[PDB]
Design a protein around this ligand. Structure first.
Ligand SMILES: Cc1cc2c(cc1C)N(C[C@H](O)[C@H](O)[C@H](O)COP(=O)(O)OP(=O)(O)OC[C@H]1O[C@@H](n3cnc4c(N)ncnc43)[C@H](O)[C@@H]1O)c1[nH]c(=O)[nH]c(=O)c1N2
Ligand SMILES: Cc1cc2c(cc1C)N(C[C@H](O)[C@H](O)[C@H](O)COP(=O)(O)OP(=O)(O)OC[C@H]1O[C@@H](n3cnc4c(N)ncnc43)[C@H](O)[C@@H]1O)c1[nH]c(=O)[nH]c(=O)c1N2
Ligand SMILES: O=c1ccn([C@@H]2O[C@H](COP(=O)(O)OP(=O)(O)O)[C@@H](O)[C@H]2O)c(=O)[nH]1
Ligand SMILES: O=c1ccn([C@@H]2O[C@H](COP(=O)(O)OP(=O)(O)O)[C@@H](O)[C@H]2O)c(=O)[nH]1
Lengths: 513, 517
């Protein structure tokens, strides 16, 4: 029997990947298409939440730096006003030995204690010499670190930090993923800086970036979904996929509505997708994949931005005097990520945990802190005591004075946080993905295609764009198969207005010869 | 005043590049478009000539091996019948020291004389030992050859050969072009074969290949062209481009016709383009480029295929006992490249140059050899003497016995043969190309983009295809900018029937279900 609805291309999920698919679909305006999502609000893991007090929090804070001109076009289309954005320059430091070491760490050894600087340079020297002779390739992430950083920097930062964020040890991850993620320190550069006492903080695709004035990052994706025809969307309890029948190519929803498709773009976690397909083979395969969970903790504090905090953006915490691995001064991204000074709110408690001097509803201004803590089957965290643990950790790292007035807290656990680049991931994905494509299912996204190298808003978005382009125009999926290619170049060819539209438009008015 | 004709995309040239452009444009069926060529027969350098005796000759004995499904799709549409193609294994040797060394030369040291083998291995060892330690990249082509084969092979084969074909010293060429062209020998593999006396002729994309049954490669591009809407073509005198006005985006033709365009795909020699544009800056930039001319020599000889010839395909001649650098037994590719054994022809002359015993029309069968001689400002050739030179060369190399009966001769000089991969090349192209792209001009092709790495029918064809995909869909031009990426992978995404066509075909199937119902 024929399904309730029938389209050429069905997109499941409405995070960056899903809307990516939809934008290109909408642009081509060829094949019939439909996008569904179990959430009444688009944006997925790039959404913003608001506290009863009025503090916005992303999912661990988010930064926008595009490798793609198409991604830029779409953003400009949803927020065209020039006061819809704020442009920032990256100010990132690392909390080490009681000091703020400018990011990247491996280029600012200069800031460390002399005693430690000697440890690090001794390692880079040993490392640099072996590299001058090596011909083989690093097997594990750990081997990589040791070869590029030396044992010194590895024990002082790399190792302990990488466990803190990945929730797994360095020896158990691959190293084919760290192209533009982990900087390989140059011996000449590093020493020079140690001598002169200068800093190197320009490295990375993070240098400069822009943030949305209003709504957090989630505001972006709401604005993006608004440019799509509503009738082709279906968001909420009515859009939740409960069953996927690959063989007869139909999708059942929560309210039992069935959708027929020729091509499926699926952005949901691939392990859930396997369940929905009731496919025992793919189920075995997807459970070879490993992932960590993410707690996001938000704290709202009264008072003008402290001078010790300054223009700091996101900070790193390798040391063990706090659960979180990274921290963001979310209040610096936009003056609308917390209430205005006039808004009155009662202090809930002080930073040390003691009750506040006065519980009356006082005025701001306020500022905001965002923290991320990882959790996995190798690194457990107590969910009930983590919120306190973080505020304690904020004191231990001198992020907060014991006397600082806390006027808002935020805690949420995202079961699927990071797609872990383990040593088995590829062996498992090179099976899963092609098999799904043989069924005409393009499984894409942070958890759709499970590749951290290219997990990220712009990447995820383009994953959805290129899947549609592959399906329709025979494009090559560069971003999915060749991360180091799309990452090392300016991707400017594909625009929100290509020839195909400019041409059909002059064929409308037309005539002339 | 507006032009006589206007299109969204204008394609100049009906070689493999332009025909590539045309195929994709026809497949998309979106923007209006047109293709012009100054020749009545599509194909360009990939076409075929016939002797008044009935011998076919390509422009160098071309061979079809593809890195793209799209290229395959299009040829299959052109020549669908299965008796339209012959498939051949690559039987290729190098002539050295009176021996036939199997290609690739640097992997078959076994067949050389022992004394020569010694020089070659010694070089590989000294080269291998330095390769183990290198951290820099070779500057010139010569530095590359020494690093990867040693002084031995360098002096015996590479150096002399490469000049003989490029018409320039290796020291003047860059080395970023030889990804899949020049094999880098593996010391362990090489010595092993020297010991065991084994051969290794599987290397290269040339291993296996197919050849058209009829019309030579020329027949392919004729067939492919007949798949295009004729009214959108203009081949011959009426299609020769004389002038290009990049400012008001208009091309002028031989007969005075003017064509307006929104996007220009030019496959003509980029230097000719610069001249046609009357742009002084570009002309100055394109005369920094270098190229070599090619002479093609065709010989039709009477008799059964000599047992000394065998199933050989093409042969390399690094030595100086002959003017040509390469030779193909063109008659092995297809039985239709020469007249049938029952057609009677008079012997023109014997190989040694003497007059034939008899001058009556005798029968076949026949076979055919095709030769290539390179020419340049550093390597002149005497155009009036080259033919006899080649014939004489064939005798010196034992290709023809002085008594062989030559029944047909052929000679043609192509001014633009190879785009030379010189050291100054990229310095010139990295200006020329973007500058032209800023005028909405996609210059693409063997001499359109001037990159040997990515010259070759399938490469040229796809250069034309990805340009259109760039102009219309926003694709990235991979072949043009990233030769080693497209060369080292299977290109299966872009098809002659893409989704777009399927869904437009379903959407009109749905609008038919409501027409009557
Ligand atoms: C902690 C942390 C930190 C960062 C980031 C990630 C994380 C978690 N990101 C990356 C980012 O959040 C990510 O790439 C996108 O959110 C991924 O989009 P996806 O669409 O692939 O998944 P995502 O999860 O976002 O979307 C999936 C969606 O599909 C839906 N869905 C699932 N199952 C469904 C079903 N059965 N039926 C209907 N709908 C269903 C979900 O509800 C949702 O709408 C980021 N990026 C960046 O650029 N800069 C950064 O700094 C960071 N930092
Ligand atoms: C000696 C030799 C040997 C080989 C090969 C070439 C050569 C020279 N090739 C490569 C191959 O022949 C090549 O890549 C294509 O023929 C290049 O086609 P283009 O379109 O780029 O130029 P090409 O010259 O082929 O075509 C361009 C065209 O534009 C036209 N034109 C020029 N000016 C014009 C004007 N003003 N107005 C209109 N039209 C104009 C020309 O007349 C022609 O029709 C090959 N390939 C392969 O894969 N296997 C092989 O074995 C070989 N070997
Ligand atoms: O000072 C630093 C901080 C980060 N890292 C490495 O860089 C990777 C990516 O950092 P990023 O902040 O970009 O990852 P995110 O969590 O934001 O996606 C981490 O896994 C670390 O291994 C580093 O080399 N030096
Ligand atoms: O035995 C051989 C024959 C070829 N060459 C190299 O391969 C290149 C290309 O040869 P090919 O016949 O493939 O070029 P074509 O003329 O067919 O494009 C030449 O420049 C030589 O440097 C080589 O390394 N060994």
């Amino acid at each position: 029997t024929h399904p309730d609805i029938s389209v050429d291309v069905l997109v499941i999920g409405a995070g960056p990947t899903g809307l990516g698919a939809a934008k290109r679909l909408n642009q081509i305006d060829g094949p019939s298409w439909m996008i569904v999502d179990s959430n009444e609000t688009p944006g997925g893991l790039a959404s913003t939440d608001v506290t009863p007090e009025g503090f916005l929090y992303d999912v661990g804070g988010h930064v926008i730096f595009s490798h793609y001109k198409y991604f830029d076009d779409c953003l400009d289309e949803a927020l065209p006003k020039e006061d819809d954005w704020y442009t920032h320059q990256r100010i990132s430091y690392v909390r080490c030995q009681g000091q703020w070491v400018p990011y990247p760490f491996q280029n600012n050894i200069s800031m460390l204690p002399k005693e430690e600087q000697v440890k690090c340079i001794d390692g880079m020297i040993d490392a640099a010499l072996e590299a001058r002779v090596a011909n083989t390739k690093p097997k594990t992430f750990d081997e990589w670190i040791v070869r590029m950083m030396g044992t010194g920097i590895a024990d002082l930062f790399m190792r302990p930090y990488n466990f803190k964020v990945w929730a797994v040890p360095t020896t158990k991850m691959q190293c084919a993923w760290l192209g533009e993620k982990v900087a390989a320190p140059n011996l000449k550069a590093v020493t020079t800086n140690v001598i002169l006492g200068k800093t190197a903080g320009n490295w990375g695709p993070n240098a400069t970036f822009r943030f949305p004035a209003r709504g957090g990052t989630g505001g972006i994706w709401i604005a993006v979904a608004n440019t799509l025809p509503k009738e082709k969307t279906r968001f909420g309890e009515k859009g939740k996929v409960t069953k996927v029948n690959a063989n007869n190519k139909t999708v059942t929803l929560q309210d039992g509505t069935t959708i027929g498709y020729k091509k499926l773009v699926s952005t949901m976690a691939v392990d859930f997708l396997a369940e929905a397909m009731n496919d025992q083979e793919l189920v075995g395969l997807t459970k070879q994949l490993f992932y960590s969970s993410t707690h996001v903790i938000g704290v709202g504090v009264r008072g003008s931005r402290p001078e010790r905090i300054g223009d700091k953006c996101w900070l790193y915490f390798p040391e063990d005097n706090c659960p979180f691995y990274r921290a963001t001064i979310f209040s610096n991204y936009s003056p609308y990520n917390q209430p205005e000074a006039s808004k009155k709110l009662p202090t809930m408690q002080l930073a040390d945990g003691s009750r506040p001097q006065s519980t009356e509803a006082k005025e701001g201004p306020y500022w905001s802190i965002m923290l991320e803590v990882s959790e996995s089957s190798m690194k457990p965290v107590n969910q009930e005591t983590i919120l306190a643990d973080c505020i304690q950790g904020l004191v231990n790292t001198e992020m907060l004075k014991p006397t600082d007035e806390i006027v808002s807290t935020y805690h949420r656990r995202f079961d699927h946080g990071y797609p872990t680049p383990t040593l088995e991931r590829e062996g498992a994905l090179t099976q899963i993905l092609p098999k799904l494509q043989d069924k005409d299912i393009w499984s894409r996204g942070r958890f759709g295609s499970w590749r951290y190298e290219v997990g990220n808003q712009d990447h995820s978005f383009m994953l959805g764009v290129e899947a549609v382009d592959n399906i329709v125009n025979g494009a090559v999926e560069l971003t999915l198969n060749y991360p180091d290619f799309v990452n090392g170049r300016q991707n400017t060819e594909r625009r929100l207005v290509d020839g195909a539209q400019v041409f059909a438009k002059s064929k409308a008015q037309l005539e002339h010869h």
